[PDB]
Design a protein around this ligand. Sequence first.
Ligand SMILES: [Br-]
Ligand SMILES: [Br-]
Ligand SMILES: [Br-]
Ligand SMILES: [Br-]
Ligand SMILES: [Br-]
Ligand SMILES: [Br-]
Ligand SMILES: [Br-]
Ligand code: NA
Length: 129
Amino acid sequence: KVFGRCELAAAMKRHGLDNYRGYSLGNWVCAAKFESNFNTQATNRNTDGSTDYGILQINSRWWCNDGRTPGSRNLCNIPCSALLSSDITASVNCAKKIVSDGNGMNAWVAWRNRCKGTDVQAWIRGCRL
Ligand SMILES: [Br-]
Ligand SMILES: [Br-]
Ligand SMILES: [Br-]
Ligand SMILES: [Br-]
Ligand SMILES: [Br-]
Ligand SMILES: [Br-]
Ligand SMILES: [Br-]
Ligand code: NA
C-alpha cells in the first residue's frame, strides 16, 4: 500500500505514534517519506546482508526475522514480512521499540539527514487531525 501523506498521519496517530518519545507526528511522517516514500512494501538490501522493510525501513539486523540475515536479532519478535502489510500496526509497534532504545529517531539515517532540524510540521500541514 502506498499511503497518502495525511492518510498516513492519521493512521500513525490512531496507533499512538504522535508525540511518542517526544517526537511529533510530523517527524514520523517525514521519516516515512524519505525511508519508503510511504510505501508499505518497500525493501532494500544493506551491504552487510541485512534488509530494511516497510514504511519505516526497519532493519532485519536487529528487529525482525527474514531467515537470511545470519547472526541477526529479532527484537520486535516478528517476521520481517509483517512489516510490509497494508496495515501499519506491526511497523508502528516495532518503531516504538526502536525509538525507545537510546538514540531516539537518529536510528533512522534518513530522518537524521533529511528531517531533523527542519520544519517537520509541514508534513502534517493541512491534514484533518
Ligand atoms: Br508528499
Ligand atoms: Br509536527
Ligand atoms: Br536470520
Ligand atoms: Br535470498
Ligand atoms: Br532477539
Ligand atoms: Br493502518
Ligand atoms: Br530522544
Ligand atoms: Na533478524
